[PDB]
Design a binder for this molecule. Structure first.
Ligand SMILES: Nc1ncnc2c1ncn2[C@@H]1O[C@H](COP(=O)(O)O)[C@@H](O)[C@H]1O
Ligand SMILES: Nc1ncnc2c1ncn2[C@@H]1O[C@H](COP(=O)(O)O)[C@@H](O)[C@H]1O
Ligand SMILES: Nc1ncnc2c1ncn2[C@@H]1O[C@H](COP(=O)(O)O)[C@@H](O)[C@H]1O
Ligand SMILES: Nc1ncnc2c1ncn2[C@@H]1O[C@H](COP(=O)(O)O)[C@@H](O)[C@H]1O
Ligand SMILES: Nc1ncnc2c1ncn2[C@@H]1O[C@H](COP(=O)(O)O)[C@@H](O)[C@H]1O
Ligand SMILES: Nc1ncnc2c1ncn2[C@@H]1O[C@H](COP(=O)(O)O)[C@@H](O)[C@H]1O
Ligand SMILES: Nc1ncnc2c1ncn2[C@@H]1O[C@H](COP(=O)(O)O)[C@@H](O)[C@H]1O
Ligand SMILES: Nc1ncnc2c1ncn2[C@@H]1O[C@H](COP(=O)(O)O)[C@@H](O)[C@H]1O
Ligand SMILES: [Mg+2]
Ligand SMILES: [Mg+2]
Ligand SMILES: [Mg+2]
Ligand SMILES: [Mg+2]
Lengths: 277, 277, 277, 277
């Protein structure tokens, strides 16, 4: 209705970063992932794999103590801030991060919001997902704040009922990105990426293989890692959404769309990303 | 003897569901898996992988507390109801599920039967396997009850000795599906799928690679997931049994039948299912 | 020197079992693996994978309590006898097994020998490896006892120094198989399989990729599983040793011999075994 | 500037060891890896996989008690010295090792230095990495001491600021290898391998896929294993650095350089090493 353009293959190709010969892990920064709780542990593994696959230099995972041992055998490249998401409720971060994500696998509690308020005093891009998404406003700060709601979460944030939202997705996503002054990645078929300066794009990739638990956790991690290796955080968000969907499309070439498990998106991304270089 | 027809490739092709572009995890429902105990933990991983591979939207695994950490690194897409199978002994479920399975890796105790009685007050299809199979009767309810005995379990349920059962498998499975008013998936070479309205089919797929611990746990999960994405639960049961056997047949093309491990059925299913689309 | 014959491809082909359409896990029996301790846990995973890959019907792993959780995510098809190897020191087994192995990852203690004495009152083939190998004698019983020493272990059992043993491997292995009335699988390049009735064979397969920790643990499991699916336990031992070596030979076609990890033998066996059918 | 030569493919080919038919795990020695702590557990898995992939006979991992269970399911071929890195602070090793590595995933503490001092009284090559790297001197001993700093660690060791170091890498690495009488593997693009007898080489392999957490942990393990199977420890160091980089180059043929995870280097090495035989 607003003729929102698609972020196309050519846009992805033009904006994906190089990984120069003369670079080291510091060049690509340290990200912080605040995710995973005792009854929702998996989201931390899913977002952690997503992030480390996506071009960062180092990853610190601030997860609940009992979730740590579940990540290590799969992702021994991550290090930990023990009970990090809980500790972030109590004080500003003393360490500097290139980008921060909070929420996958976290409960929708006031303590999580206290951690959000603390993380937002850092000077870096911050992603809020899942349990960190609430009806609230956001402080003026330098770095972008990126919200990644599915339509149910968007209802929670805005009071716009899902059946109404789905009739005018880009109109609502844009209106709320403007009002909140946050980026909004409104998930679904033709995911909307709405920027608070009024730029808006639709994502052309993806399919129903993604319509299963965990896929958004992987996405959150992909955005996190891409924020570390892209100079322009807009490109990081857009490329992450695009490549996430493209991994599902590769899967369905030889596998049924009913059978994908989220973590496999991370396994597919290395070859998919290569195709866009 | 009763000329029971085979559920054929063409039946599978005609009844497997689509996964539409305009769908999300809610479209494919949330299943509940009540499985896995401290000395039989593996069944929960096997049924959990089977279920998430088979087209559901979300999976909640109600397993013993100490089994949880053993599933997460392999299946980070599942969430948990801590000690769920034990808690189900005490009260009706307050959450709504698209389908429920109970029994793989559970002991054959009265407490498991109490959980069965509670789960049966939900309005959804329910699968009973392994430890949940007992000599008993079933309350009138809307959703189908699907029993998945091997011949030893069928003896436990009915008093029909295995050596007699094996002479007239479909006759006994049909008689007991009618008497109990449950679906009976009577396992073995030429698995019988007997419906309580008198429909009955034989499964043409599978081989001796399946004659090893855990394969039925994987099957239970496959039925669970297929109940979530098929409109007709009869088709879900039939397709699950068929595709389970077909995965073993793919394995034996290049691998010895002596060497299959149950979890690999789940790894094979993505490509096998694609062939039937 | 004694012109001991090789167990050849044609011998393997002639003696490997079928896995009939009309069979179930009971047909292929339940094995018991008594293995793995707190500072040597890995041997239980290695022997467990080896066994379940090798044609048994069910596997019960009697391992230390804290080792259980380390096996489950890799081998969810196994079930457990909690602290089984320790409990076997106290009483005869009340359950019937098709075959038993004891020792991989167990300490060389008197308590392990007490478990050995108890396991030997069962009527089935029994394999002793690693910590279960000691200087001792064996009671008259129906089922074969199969010892799987490397030359260091053979010295421990016999007092024959390794440098002397290696000069006349088959002569010593035969002499001691006769004296003890046990099968002796004397490991190394050209493994000797000596039977207490005086039959003796050399194994023609294998290479230096096997000269690394854990490979014998995998072998012990392979023998265990093959004892369950072969009618003649001599063939089970011989085929296991042969196929174990053949998996290393397949590895070295495209991978360096320096780089094999024991568990990968188990991953290779499905395709290798197929070649001999 | 000093015209330091590259260690080339032809050098690697000429110096990689054989793995003879008549060999066993003792031929290739037992290594000790002192690595992994509660908030940095992954380094032990990464270095452990690296080491066992690289031609040793046995590996003992002296890691913190709670890290053990995280390694076993991935690397069941390793055995353990429980809390080994901590115990090494208290006394000389009573066991003989072919080579020792200390530091990956260890904190930069005085207790780690006490363990270093004890390990150095053994008569074998010793690698110091990560937490074991400090500003210090080294006792006269037979076996080489091999330091594996990245430029940040080199600053910690020497006071040479990174921006100055990077202008004259080989000059500084050589000067400090001479002064300390240690081997220095100065990491980065064109890694410098400086020997204390004044030999020095540059590594021609590798790319930005390596510029991510954990890759140096894998390298430390590769050096450790190669020290066990090479007669000349200089060749072991040089070959390890070379093959490590070559694995990254193989990865980038079909996968994006942004997406490599360190543990995958270990998965690639078997085929890469084969190419140089
Ligand atoms: N190749 C390199 N060149 C320059 N600095 C480096 C290099 N590798 C690591 N560093 C520095 O050391 C830090 C990493 O320390 P660590 O994570 O403790 O191993 C980086 O953030 C850089 O500041
Ligand atoms: N049918 C579909 N087509 C394309 N993308 C989808 C579809 N269903 C779900 N997704 C994506 O899967 C993810 C779901 O996020 P979440 O609900 O947080 O797991 C988002 O990236 C969605 O845009
Ligand atoms: N693409 C979508 N369109 C409409 N509703 C959705 C979509 N994705 C998620 N939801 C809603 O939110 C619920 C999932 O919430 P959660 O499992 O907490 O992430 C679903 O059951 C739906 O009711
Ligand atoms: N020989 C065989 N041919 C076909 N299917 C088999 C065979 N042996 C076992 N199965 C199947 O393997 C599963 C065994 O279930 P369970 O005993 O619960 O593990 C069922 O789906 C059986 O029908
Ligand atoms: N296809 C089958 N035909 C006959 N008996 C079976 C079959 N599958 C399982 N059983 C019996 O039930 C036992 C397995 O029980 P469980 O291990 O408790 O699932 C087997 O040892 C058999 O005695
Ligand atoms: N160089 C070699 N050639 C053939 N087989 C070997 C070689 N080195 C070791 N093995 C085998 O590897 C296993 C070692 O057993 P263990 O010492 O118990 O791990 C046995 O099956 C040996 O025969
Ligand atoms: N094929 C073989 N030939 C000679 N000695 C061996 C062989 N395999 C193992 N050993 C000896 O036994 C030791 C291994 O014992 P273990 O690690 O306890 O299994 C080796 O270090 C050797 O001294
Ligand atoms: N851009 C690059 N080119 C080649 N090697 C690299 C590059 N970045 C990092 N490395 C290597 O990756 C490892 C990093 O070690 P560490 O910082 O200890 O993880 C070392 O082997 C470095 O030489
Ligand atoms: Mg989500
Ligand atoms: Mg069963
Ligand atoms: Mg051994
Ligand atoms: Mg390092």
């Amino acid at each position: 209705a607003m003729n929102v353009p698609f972020w196309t293959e050519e846009h992805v190709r033009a904006t994906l970063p190089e990984r120069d010969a003369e670079s080291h892990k510091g060049t690509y920064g340290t990200a912080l992932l605040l995710a995973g709780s005792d009854d929702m542990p998996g989201a931390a593994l899913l977002a952690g794999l997503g992030a480390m696959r996506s071009g960062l230099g180092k990853l610190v995972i601030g997860t609940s103590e009992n979730v740590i041992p579940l990540i290590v055998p799969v992702l021994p490249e991550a290090t930990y801030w023990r009970d990090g998401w809980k500790k972030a409720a109590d004080a500003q971060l003393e360490e500097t991060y290139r980008a921060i994500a909070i929420g996958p696998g976290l409960p929708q509690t006031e303590s999580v919001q206290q951690a959000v308020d603390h993380v937002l005093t850092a000077d870096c891009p911050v992603i809020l997902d899942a349990g960190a998404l609430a009806k609230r406003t956001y402080p003026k700060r330098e770095g972008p704040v990126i919200l990644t709601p599915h339509p149910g979460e968007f209802f929670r944030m805005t009071g716009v009922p899902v059946n109404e939202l789905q009739k005018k997705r880009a109109e609502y996503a844009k209106e709320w990105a403007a009002q909140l002054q946050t980026v909004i990645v409104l998930k679904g078929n033709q995911t909307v990426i709405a920027f608070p300066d009024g730029d808006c794009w639709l994502n052309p990739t993806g399919n129903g293989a993604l319509a299963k638990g965990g896929t958004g956790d992987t996405l959150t991690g992909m955005i996190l890692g891409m924020l570390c290796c892209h100079e322009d955080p807009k490109h990081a968000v857009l490329n992450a959404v695009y490549l996430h969907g493209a991994c599902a499309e590769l899967w369905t070439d030889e596998h049924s769309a009913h059978t994908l498990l989220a973590h496999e998106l991370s396994d597919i991304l290395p070859r998919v990303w290569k195709r866009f270089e």
